[PDB]
Structures are given as structure tokens and as C-alpha cells.
Design a protein around this ligand. Structure first.
Ligand SMILES: Nc1ncnc2c1ncn2[C@@H]1O[C@H](COP(=O)(O)OP(=O)(O)O)[C@@H](O)[C@H]1O
Lengths: 146, 70, 40, 99, 378, 30, 116, 378
């Protein structure tokens, strides 16, 4: 094993790619970071349903044979969402806004936990919430909190 | 016998050394780096590297041709 | 397993060392010192 | 007053320094002070451990002696013991439960 | 409610163990017991108590009132779930499960607590639930269950400062370190005595003051007594309300050795009668004696033995038999002469005494890995 | 004494890392 | 009683036999303690006159104290038993730990790197 | 005889399991006769490599106990002595396992109860090692040889084989023999003078059968003389219930050496006209001689002014540079290296299922030389 590393490390590097989506006859469409898209093959050890759209790959460089699935990169919402860095909140930091909590529960909480409860009255569920008042009054932390 | 092979492997870290930057590993001792050429790669690594010296965002060393960790 | 032939048939340990040293010695000091006040 | 305590003891460490033993009657003369409060005050030095030594009641010889003892060697090897005992306690949790 | 709940356990101690003192405790403890819905924790206390023959209706009215509080939980869980709030069922018994904890036993108080642990996404309820599990982990003296939620507790204070959840917490760890004979840790948890508050469990803050001075007077040395507990205004004024402890502390500090034992019998006897100090007051004063002997005895080399009676504490042969068992107990580093009637001191260099604990721990772990290596692999 | 005191415990931990490699391999493979 | 320092009590049982003669056994026992008291002339004592250790066995003044006082030391003198309490020669030896310990260090090195 | 010894035992058990000593000793007996016909066919007829001998050394061994619990105390054991010498004679020749083990504790168990010479025969015995005797006979075996040097005067030789017999003993119950190794294990260290707290694990052993025996060492940890007699009258019969009393009777020596190390350590210039009174010896005139032999046998060193009466003692400190604790190391250096060595030797059985160290591949090597040939032509 240890002598073998002197030999096998002479093998060249592996490309990394990015699946758009697959097409017919065991082929996929993969684009590099700053290098164009390619219609390439798969190896035998990779399943097509295991091939996900929007997923990185290991790629050999000589024939662009598909090598291995590169784990996962990011959600396009977690990424930007984190970039924003909203100050996450909770009920336990609410200072005396209890009826406002009870109102917003009625608009938002109920058509999730009990969507049928409005079919109990034959009325449509609400969709929109307007929140107002002076600034510095808990708008952000309540909205994130819910 | 084995110690003949043991120090023998380090010839690849001769002197024509190009620079990448470590990104992550799939598993033990086989990884993914970000080259100073701009592109990223799935590479192999020298075994004697203390792996716990890795990842602030690690300045690593790549072979210029075989393109693996040095 | 465990056939075990029968020829015959914290909370404890800090209390056991102070049981070892603190064993049989006068047991009831409120009066020993108050009677050594005048005798000693 | 409190500055006089530190000045009193600043002299008191000053004259006591060059020897190993002396009688209280000379240091009382050499600080030009009494013997009872100096005897009690030297006792407070060796109660508060700011100065260390011993005292006598028969004539008042203060035996002064100092060496820094070896401390780093034994206790720092001793707390490794109670680390490893807890490690063996964790070995119950992967050994006794498992096989 | 668990806030007055420690005095209940202390008065269980006051009922049983002073055997002659078993009348006013079975008065006032019953006075608290056959009200406020208490049903479970005193059946064997009734066994240690007298007959109290007609307790049947007394239990029936209170298991009935308990049945009212349980059946209104049964009136609550269904309107709580039809329109769901923040799981209003566990929001009801997240507060009334402590009523199930004082009134019910640890099972309905435990589950519902580990149940509601997964409800509140913030530790503002979680860590106080953990405080409740700590407090029942003291009541049932669940010395392993406190080890869990102490760490599970401490795992939450790092986010936030939560000094009402840490300084309060250090009171609990000080009470455990003084529950066991861990006194250098008990005073260390009792170090602040300022952010500690006029508590619920030491409702006298000055009782907390007495406890931290009693543990500190062993736990720390002079270089710490002559700066720390002597210069605290926070500590001086509260024992300025104390005549005895002020005298009891200063009789060691002012070298007042003869009046020291006088207050030592009283403080030690109070510690005898006190709950939770009753395991270890012997351990207390056996250290207080040899500490007061060593403190004076490391000042003189040629002090005779008939000095210490009239000046230190009376009884020459009492000093004789007390010192002989301490040198013979392997401490009190000196050497007593007898028939020329003089006590000599020595000095042990820290090379033998420091070696002793090393070979102790090495033998202990030798026993440990010896035992494990026999245990595993058959 | 301390070095020999650690070394045994280390190798013991290693044998536990072997008995996990035995007992949960004999039933799994056969 | 021959376990502990009970001497006098043993010499009281020498003569206080209720069973039978036992005489040949208390004469072996009359000797095996003779050389033992002759052992404990040789302990770290002061000058003993010709009365104390003279009467510790069972003799008034025969030349049996010349037999012991010329057998061992504590030499017959002017009412005197001489203390040659030297015990001086044996300490301060580094070479025997430098032999044995240097054996034991290689003994450490045996089961240390080279396989057993 | 794997079928007929199992189909012997399988009815030889349930008769003699409950024992039913009412019209069952002859049925048991004749069934033992039939199993003994199988045992003689085992002793004579083709036991080679079949576990005819080995498989029925377990059946023979286990039937020695029912055999020994109807046919020992009720019947004559001394015939089973010579039958057991013949059983040992055919052992160790044809096969050296499982007959080298059980036939020696099963030889020992009434010879210990007797006073026959066979303790020194057990010294000169070859079968003292039965080579990994299955951790049950092997475990108790070290105890069975421990009480040998107990009745033949423990010189701290076998307290390690008592300790070793203890640590090889299983998790079943202490009332079997683990009481008696828990008692006798220290009984021999009370003979030395050393004593730990015994009662530290109050499971099913450290509440029931200790109180005379811990009450014994409670007196031993004192420096009192007739306190030992106040134990020895109080539970002279309880120590005769086990039969340790002949070892109990000799402890006055270690009590008084405990006292003289205690006082000789405690006081320095103390009269001999004080130590007889304090040790309640009632005679100072031989308290010259107990003290004198305390010098003679080792223990205490310094002189008695036999003319005056004070026994002076010198202050012997700095035992560190005295090369005793290097030996206290080297005993444990070597052993701790050994238990690392055993943690190596017990470790390497795992190494298995290491099928193939495949270098790289074959077909991908053909592709490497193929694309290499493309770049080489290129
Ligand atoms: N009820 C409240 N409890 C605690 N903090 C509050 C509350 N209301 C406002 N704050 C503080 O005001 C800030 C939030 O402002 P907010 O009203 O949520 O958004 P905006 O000010 O943009 O309307 C936070 O930093 C918060 O700590």
C-alpha cells in the first residue's frame, strides 16, 4: 500500500463539474466553473436517479467520464438568506405584545396547523399581513419569530 | 524493508511546486482543492501530512502535473 | 453461564471513612466542653 | 496607619534578612521598638506566611530557612491520573456495554 | 410549586432523625402536609410518624382535589389542540406538571418535563425546567441525575450571559459541593456572595453568609482570609448582624484560641443539628482542631505542652491525647517530648508528603485498570 | 511511571476498537 | 507469649506447669531464651551495672555473666557493660545501584522496543 | 459417552439438584454407580482426541459436587480420596487439561477441612498449574491455595493470590465464597498490620456478615489492648462459626506492634512508666522487654535509657533520598510495563479478514497506458 502511493500519485488531477440535467442514452449535461457545458457519459457505478439536477460531480479529464458525485453545494436561499443575516427571535424575547401575538396566530398559525378549520366555516384562508406602528417596536423580531 | 519505502515516496515534493488552496475532502485522505489557477480539483494527498493541520482555508501545495496534494 | 456453586446459601463512602475515624467518641458534644469550662 | 504597617514590615523584612538566627532583644534594639508587639508581629508574619521561619519562647531565637520545593513534577503527573481514571470510566461505556 | 419545597425536606429531617424532637415537626409538617394537595411523599413519613388513624378522608379530599386539577387538564388538552397555539397542552402542563411534580411524584413530573423540553425552542423555559429537575434531583438526592442536567444546564448559558441562570446555578453547585465534603469547591462556588440573591431556599441571605464563612474558614488560608473575608463590605456588614459568627471568625483571626473552642462547641453543635451538615460536622471540627493546632504550632519550635492549657485551651492531658492522635494520625507535623515536658516542631520538605498522594493515586488507578482488564475480555 | 501508566490504557482502548471490529462483524458477515 | 516481648511471663510459666514434668522441654526452652537474652545484651543500651542485666536472666552473681560478658561484648569492667554501638560501616553505596539499576534499565529496554 | 454421559448427567442432575435426602441417597448413589461405569469406560476405553475424557471432565467435575453433597458429608469421603488419587493418576498422562484442574480443588476441599500433610504435597505438586483453568476453578483455586499459607503462616505471600482470586471472581453473589475471601483476604493483612475500609460496597455483603469482623478491626485500628479482648469475648463463637479463630487468636502481637509504632511515632522522650499504663499492660517491668524486642525485631530503632526510664526516639525524616521509593517504583514500573505488554498480547487476535492489498487496478492501468500512449504519440 505504501509503495503503491509512489505510483498511483502519478495519476493526473480530476475535474469538478456541475449537472444541469441528464438526457437520453446514459448521458448528462455538465458545465465547469468557468468553462463551457459538455454532453458526457456516466460510468457504470452511477445511477441516473442518483444523478440529481444541480449537483457537482467528479470528472475524469481524458475522456470526461463521470467519476463521482460531489456531495452538495448550497441552497440558493440558504446562501443569500444567510448573506442577509436576519436576527432570529422567539416568543421568549417578546416584551408585552400578547394580543398582537394572538392576532398573528389567527392569520398565520391557523392555516398551517388547521387548514380544515376554515373549511369548517366555509370561508377562504387569509393571505396577507400588514404590520404598522413606529419603528423599533418589534416588527422584525415578531415576523421572524412566527 | 518498509522504511526504505517510507521516506521514498516524498520525491514528488521536489521543487517544481505549484500552489492550490484546500477546500474539503470527500472522505479520509482524498480531497478537493481550489487552485491558484482558478479551477478546482478532486485530488489525492501525501499520507504524512497531519490532516489536523488543515482548513483555516489551507494554503496547500499541488503537483504541477499529477495535480495532487503535496 | 453463572452456575456458581454455593457452599453457603456517593451516599455511602465519604460517610464510611468519617465512619471509620469518627466511630466511637463521645457522640454528643454540647455539654462536654461546657463541663470542661469549670473542671478544666 | 496602614502605610505604617507596610513601612513597619518593610523595615521588618529589611533587618531580618542577613542572618539565620537572632534574639528578639537585638532586633527590638535595631528597629528600636518593643519585644511583645514585635514578637506578635513576627508571629503574624509566620501566620500570614508572608515571612516563614520559626520562633522560640525560651529566649526568642528566630530560625530562618528557605528553599523552593519541587512542585511541578508530582502534582502535574498526579492530575493526569485522575484524567485517565475517568478515561477508564469511559471505557466502561464502550467496553462493558458492548462486548 | 417547588420554591418552598426544600424546607419540606429539611423538616422531614427535623421529624425523623432527632428522635426526641418529633412532636412539633409532626405538627407543622402535617400542617403543611394535609394541605396544599400533598398526597404521595409522606406515607412512610406516616410510618415513621404515629398512627394518625383517620387520614382516609384527609387523603380522599386531596386526591379528589388532585383529581380536579387532573380532570381540568382533561378539560384543557382538547380545546388546546382544536385551535393549536404553541402546543397549548404542553403549555398547560408545562406549568402544571410542576404541580404534578410537587403533588405528583417524579414520574408525571419527569416525563412531562422531558416532554415539554422539546416544545420551547428557546432555553428560557428549557433551562428553568432543568432547574426544576435539579431541585427534585436534590429532593430525591438523585446524585447521578443531577450530573446529567448540570451539564445539560451549563450547555445553555454559553449562548447569552444569563447571569440569573448562572449565578443562581452556582448556588446549586455550591449546595452539592457542600452536600459532599468538597469544601474547597463549595466555597469556590460560594465565592461571589453578591450576585447571589435573597433566595427562596436560603431565604435568609445571612444563612448563605454563615454557610460560605463556615466552608471558607477551612477552604482558604490566611493570605485569603486576611484580604478576602476581612475586607468584604458585603461580608462584614451581614455578619455585623451576627454576634457569634463574627466572634467565631475573629477568634481565629485575632489569635483568640481559648474563646475559640467556646464558640466552636456552639457552632459545631448547630452544624450537628443542621440538615445536610449532619453528614459531615465531625469532618468539619476534626479539621478545625488540627487547623488551629497547626496554625499556632507552626509559629513556635520550643513551646512546651503546659503552655497551651491556660493560653490555648484548658486541659493538659486533653491536649496530650488530642495531639498524640494527630501526630499519630500522621498529620500535625511536629514531635512532642514528654518527660521533659516540651513540644518540638519540625519541617517536612514537600518531597515526601507530596510523594504520598502520588503513590496513593497510582495504586488507585492500578486497582482500576487491574479491575477493568480482568472485567473485559471475559 | 506515568508514561508506562498511559501506554497500557492506550493499547487497551485499541483492543476495544478491535472487539467492536469482531463482535459486530461475526453476525453481520458470518 | 514467645511471639511478643513477653519474657518474664514465659519464665513464670517455666515452673508453673500443672500438667507434668515438661522439664526436658523447658530446658531447651531454658536455653533458646538464654541465647536470646544474650542477644538482647547487644541492643542500643547505656552502661548497665553488674546488677540489672545480671538479674535479667535468673542469676545472682556466678561467672555465667563472665560467660556472657566474655561470650559477647558489653565487657566486664568497673561495674560496667561497654557499648560498641557503631553501626557505621554499611551505608553510602552508589555502585551496587549502579550495577543492579544499570541491569534494570537494560531490562526496561528489553520489553520496550524489541518485540517479545 | 458424549451421549451416555450427557444422558447420565441429564438424569443425574434432577434427582440430586433439590437433593431429596429422603429415600434418594441410594437412588442418587446407584445412578452415580451407573455414571461411574461410564466414568470407568471413560478412564479406560478410548478417550483419545474425542473429548471422551475432556467433555466428561466437565460432567465428572460437576458430578463431583452432587457426589460431594450427598456422598461427602453424609457418606465417607476418604474413599473418594483414593478414588480421586486414581482419577488424578489417569489424569495428566493421557491428557493434561480439565483433569489437571478440577481434581485439585476437588482434592483440596476436605484436606483444608482436615489437617492432613497435603499442603506441602501441594507445594511439591506438579499440577499446581492446570493451564488456564476456565476462570472458575482457576479463580477459586488461588483462594484454595491462599488459606494454605494462612494456616501455614502468611508472610504476605498469598495476599496477592487472595486478591487475585478475588479479582478473577464473577458477578453472581458474594454469599458463595466472596464473603470469605472478602473476610480472609484482609485477615492476612491484619496479620501484617495494614487495613483498609472493608465495608465500602454495601450491596449484599457489606451489611450482613461484617459486624463482628469489622468490629474486630475497629479494635485493631485502636492502640488498645483489652479492647481486643472485648471483641474476642463478644464474637469468639462467630469467628468459630467459620473456623478462622485460630488465625484470630494471634493478633495481639500486631495490636501491640500497632501500639508501639503508634506511640513511638507519637511521643519522643516518653517514660516506660507511662506506656504500660497507657497500653494497659499492668507491668512496666516487662514493658522494658516488649519495647526491647520492638527494637530487636526491627520496628523502632532508638534507645531506652533503661536506668532512667524514658525511651528516646530520634526524628528520622528524608526517606526520599533513602532509596526505598525507587523500589516502590521499580516494583510498579516493571509491572506496568507488563500490563502494557499484556494489553499488546491480548490485542492482536482481531487482525483478520485482510483479504487483498490491491495495488491499483488492471483495466484502469490499461487505460493509463492507453491514454499515456495517446499523449506519448501526441
Ligand atoms: N417588544 C420588544 N421586545 C424586545 N425588544 C424589542 C421589542 N420591540 C423592539 N425591540 C427592539 O427593537 C429592535 C427591533 O425593531 P423592529 O420594530 O423589530 O423593526 P423596525 O424597528 O424596523 O420596525 C430590536 O433590536 C429589538 O431588540
Amino acid at each position: 500500500l505504501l509503495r503503491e502511493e509512489l505510483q498511483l500519485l502519478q495519476e493526473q488531477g480530476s475535474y469538478v463539474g456541475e449537472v444541469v440535467r441528464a438526457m437520453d442514452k446514459k448521458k448528462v449535461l455538465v458545465k465547469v466553473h468557468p468553462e463551457g457545458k459538455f454532453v458526457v457519459d456516466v460510468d457504470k457505478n452511477i445511477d441516473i436517479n442518483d444523478v440529481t439536477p444541480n449537483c457537482r460531480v467528479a470528472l475524469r479529464n481524458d475522456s470526461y467520464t463521470l467519476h463521482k458525485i460531489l456531495p452538495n453545494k448550497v441552497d440558493p436561499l440558504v446562501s443569500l438568506m444567510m448573506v442577509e443575516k436576519v436576527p432570529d427571535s422567539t416568543y421568549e424575547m417578546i416584551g408585552g405584545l400578547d394580543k398582537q401575538i394572538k392576532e398573528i396566530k389567527e392569520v398565520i398559525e391557523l392555516p398551517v396547523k388547521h387548514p380544515e378549520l376554515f373549511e369548517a366555516l366555509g370561508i377562504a384562508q387569509p393571505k396577507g399581513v400588514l404590520l404598522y406602528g413606529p419603528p423599533g417596536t418589534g416588527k422584525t423580531l415578531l415576523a421572524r419569530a412566527v | 524493508e518498509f522504511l526504505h519505502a517510507q521516506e521514498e515516496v516524498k520525491r514528488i515534493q521536489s521543487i517544481p511546486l505549484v500552489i492550490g488552496q484546500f477546500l474539503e475532502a470527500v472522505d479520509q485522505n482524498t480531497a478537493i482543492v481550489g487552485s491558484t489557477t482558478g479551477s478546482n480539483y478532486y485530488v489525492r494527498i501525501l499520507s504524512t501530512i497531519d490532516r489536523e493541520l488543515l482548513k483555516p482555508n489551507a494554503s496547500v501545495a499541488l503537483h504541477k502535473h499529477s495535480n495532487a496534494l503535496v | 453461564m453463572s452456575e456458581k456453586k454455593q457452599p453457603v446459601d456517593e451516599d455511602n463512602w465519604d460517610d464510611d471513612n468519617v465512619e471509620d475515624d469518627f466511630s466511637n467518641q463521645l457522640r454528643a458534644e454540647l455539654e462536654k466542653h461546657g463541663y470542661k469550662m469549670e473542671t478544666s | 496607619a496602614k502605610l505604617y504597617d507596610n513601612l513597619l514590615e518593610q523595615n521588618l523584612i529589611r533587618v531580618i534578612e542577613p542572618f539565620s538566627r537572632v534574639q528578639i532583644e537585638h532586633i527590638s534594639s535595631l528597629i528600636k521598638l518593643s519585644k511583645a508587639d514585635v514578637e506578635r508581629k513576627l508571629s503574624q508574619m509566620i501566620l500570614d506566611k508572608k515571612f516563614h521561619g520559626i520562633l522560640d519562647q525560651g529566649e526568642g531565637v528566630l530560625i530562618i530557612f528557605d528553599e523552593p520545593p519541587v512542585d511541578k513534577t508530582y502534582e502535574a503527573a498526579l492530575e493526569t491520573i485522575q484524567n485517565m481514571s475517568k478515561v477508564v470510566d469511559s471505557l466502561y461505556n464502550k467496553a462493558k456495554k458492548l462486548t | 410549586p417547588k420554591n418552598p419545597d426544600l424546607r419540606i425536606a429539611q423538616l422531614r429531617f427535623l421529624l425523623s432523625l432527632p428522635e426526641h424532637r418529633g412532636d412539633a415537626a409532626v405538627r407543622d409538617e402535617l400542617m403543611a402536609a394535609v394541605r396544599d394537595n400533598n398526597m404521595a411523599p409522606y406515607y412512610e413519613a406516616l410510618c415513621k410518624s404515629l398512627d394518625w388513624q383517620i387520614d382516609v378522608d384527609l387523603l380522599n379530599k386531596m386526591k379528589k382535589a388532585n383529581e380536579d386539577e387532573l380532570k381540568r387538564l382533561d378539560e384543557e388538552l382538547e380545546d388546546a389542540e382544536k385551535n393549536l397555539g404553541e402546543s397549548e397542552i404542553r403549555d398547560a402542563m408545562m406549568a402544571k406538571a410542576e404541580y404534578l411534580c410537587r403533588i405528583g411524584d417524579k414520574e408525571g413530573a419527569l416525563t412531562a418535563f422531558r416532554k415539554t423540553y422539546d416544545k420551547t425552542v428557546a432555553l428560557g423555559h428549557r433551562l428553568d425546567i432543568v432547574f426544576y429537575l435539579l431541585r427534585i434531583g436534590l429532593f430525591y438526592m438523585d446524585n447521578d441525575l443531577i450530573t446529567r442536567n448540570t451539564e445539560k444546564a451549563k450547555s445553555l448559558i454559553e449562548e447569552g450571559g444569563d447571569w440569573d441562570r448562572r449565578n443562581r446555578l452556582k448556588v446549586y453547585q455550591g449546595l452539592y459541593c457542600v452536600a459532599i465534603r468538597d469544601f474547597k469547591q463549595a466555597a469556590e462556588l460560594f465565592l461571589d456572595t453578591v450576585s447571589t440573591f435573597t433566595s427562596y431556599e436560603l431565604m435568609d441571605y445571612k444563612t448563605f453568609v454563615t454557610y460560605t464563612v463556615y466552608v471558607s474558614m477551612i477552604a482558604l488560608e490566611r493570605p485569603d482570609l486576611r484580604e478576602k473575608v476581612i475586607k468584604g463590605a458585603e461580608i462584614l456588614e451581614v455578619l455585623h448582624s451576627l454576634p457569634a459568627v463574627r466572634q467565631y471568625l475573629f477568634s481565629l483571626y485575632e489569635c483568640r484560641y481559648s474563646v475559640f473552642f467556646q464558640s466552636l462547641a456552639v457552632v459545631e453543635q448547630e452544624m450537628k443539628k443542621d440538615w445536610l451538615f449532619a453528614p459531615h460536622y465531625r469532618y468539619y471540627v476534626r479539621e478545625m482542631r488540627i487547623h488551629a493546632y497547626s496554625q499556632l504550632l507552626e509559629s513556635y519550635r520550643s513551646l512546651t505542652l503546659g503552655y497551651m492549657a491556660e493560653a490555648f485551651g484548658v486541659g493538659v492531658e486533653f491536649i496530650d491525647q488530642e495531639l498524640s492522635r494527630f501526630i499519630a494520625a500522621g498529620r500535625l507535623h511536629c514531635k512532642i517530648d514528654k518527660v521533659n515536658e516540651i513540644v518540638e516542631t519540625n519541617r517536612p520538605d514537600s518531597k515526601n508528603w507530596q510523594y504520598q498522594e502520588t503513590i496513593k493515586k497510582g495504586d488507585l488507578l492500578l486497582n482500576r485498570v487491574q479491575k477493568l482488564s480482568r472485567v473485559i475480555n471475559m | 511511571y506515568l508514561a508506562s501508566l498511559i501506554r497500557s490504557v492506550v493499547a487497551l482502548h485499541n483492543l476495544i476498537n478491535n472487539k467492536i471490529a469482531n463482535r459486530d462483524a461475526e453476525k453481520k458477515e458470518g | 507469649y514467645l511471639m511478643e516481648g513477653s519474657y518474664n511471663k514465659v519464665f513464670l510459666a517455666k515452673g508453673n506447669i500443672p500438667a507434668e514434668s515438661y522439664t526436658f522441654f523447658i530446658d531447651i526452652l531454658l536455653d533458646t531464651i538464654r541465647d536470646e537474652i544474650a542477644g538482647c545484651i547487644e541492643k542500643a543500651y547505656e552502661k548497665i551495672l553488674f546488677t540489672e542485666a545480671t538479674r535479667i536472666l535468673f542469676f545472682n552473681t556466678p561467672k555465667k555473666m563472665t560467660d556472657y560478658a566474655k561470650k559477647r561484648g558489653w565487657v566486664l569492667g568497673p561495674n560496667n557493660y561497654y557499648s560498641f554501638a557503631s553501626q557505621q560501616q554499611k551505608p553510602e553505596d552508589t555502585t551496587i545501584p549502579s550495577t543492579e539499576l544499570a541491569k534494570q534499565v537494560i531490562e526496561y529496554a528489553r520489553q520496550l522496543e524489541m518485540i517479545v | 459417552r458424549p451421549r451416555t454421559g450427557k444422558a447420565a448427567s441429564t438424569p443425574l442432575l434432577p434427582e440430586v439438584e433439590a437433593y431429596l435426602q429422603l429415600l434418594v441417597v441410594i437412588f442418587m448413589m446407584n445412578s452415580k454407580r451407573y455414571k461411574e461405569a461410564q466414568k470407568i469406560s471413560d478412564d479406560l476405553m478410548q478417550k483419545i482426541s474425542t473429548q471422551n475424557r475432556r467433555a466428561l471432565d466437565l460432567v465428572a467435575a460437576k458430578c463431583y459436587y452432587y457426589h460431594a453433597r450427598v456422598y461427602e458429608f453424609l457418606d465417607k469421603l476418604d474413599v473418594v480420596r483414593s478414588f480421586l488419587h486414581a482419577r488424578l493418576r489417569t489424569a495428566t498422562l493421557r491428557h493434561d487439561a480439565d483433569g489437571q484442574a478440577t481434581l485439585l480443588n476437588l482434592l483440596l476441599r476436605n484436606y483444608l477441612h482436615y489437617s492432613l500433610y497435603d499442603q506441602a504435597e501441594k507445594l511439591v505438586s506438579k499440577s499446581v498449574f492446570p493451564e488456564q483453568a476456565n476462570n472458575n476453578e482457576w479463580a477459586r483455586y488461588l483462594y484454595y491455595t491462599g488459606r494454605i499459607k494462612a494456616i501455614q503462616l502468611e508472610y504476605s505471600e498469598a495476599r496477592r493470590t487472595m486478591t487475585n482470586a478475588l479479582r478473577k471472581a464473577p458477578q453472581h453473589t458474594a454469599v458463595g465464597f466472596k464473603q470469605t475471601v472478602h473476610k480472609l483476604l484482609i485477615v492476612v493483612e491484619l496479620l501484617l498490620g495494614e487495613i483498609p475500609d472493608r465495608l465500602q460496597f454495601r450491596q449484599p455483603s457489606l451489611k450482613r456478615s461484617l459486624m463482628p469482623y469489622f468490629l474486630l478491626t475497629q479494635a485493631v485500628r485502636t492502640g488498645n489492648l483489652a479492647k481486643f479482648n472485648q471483641v474476642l469475648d463478644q464474637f469468639g463463637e462467630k469467628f468459630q462459626a467459620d473456623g478462622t479463630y485460630t488465625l484470630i487468636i494471634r493478633l495481639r502481637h500486631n495490636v501491640i506492634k500497632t501500639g508501639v509504632r503508634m506511640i513511638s511515632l507519637s511521643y519522643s522522650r516518653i517514660s516506660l512508666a507511662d506506656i504500660a499504663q497507657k497500653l494497659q499492660l499492668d507491668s512496666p517491668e516487662d514493658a522494658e522487654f516488649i519495647v526491647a524486642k520492638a527494637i530487636r525485631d526491627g520496628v523502632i530503632e532508638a534507645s531506652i535509657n533503661h536506668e532512667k526510664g524514658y525511651v528516646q526516639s530520634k526524628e528520622m525524616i528524608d526517606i526520599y533520598s533513602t532509596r526505598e521509593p525507587q523500589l516502590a517504583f521499580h516494583q510498579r514500573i516493571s509491572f506496568c510495563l507488563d500490563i502494557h505488554n499484556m494489553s499488546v498480547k491480548a490485542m492482536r487476535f482481531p487482525p483478520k479478514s485482510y483479504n487483498k492489498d490491491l495495488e491499483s487496478a488492471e483495466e484502469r492501468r490499461e487505460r493509463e497506458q492507453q491514454d499515456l500512449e495517446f499523449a506519448k504519440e501526441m
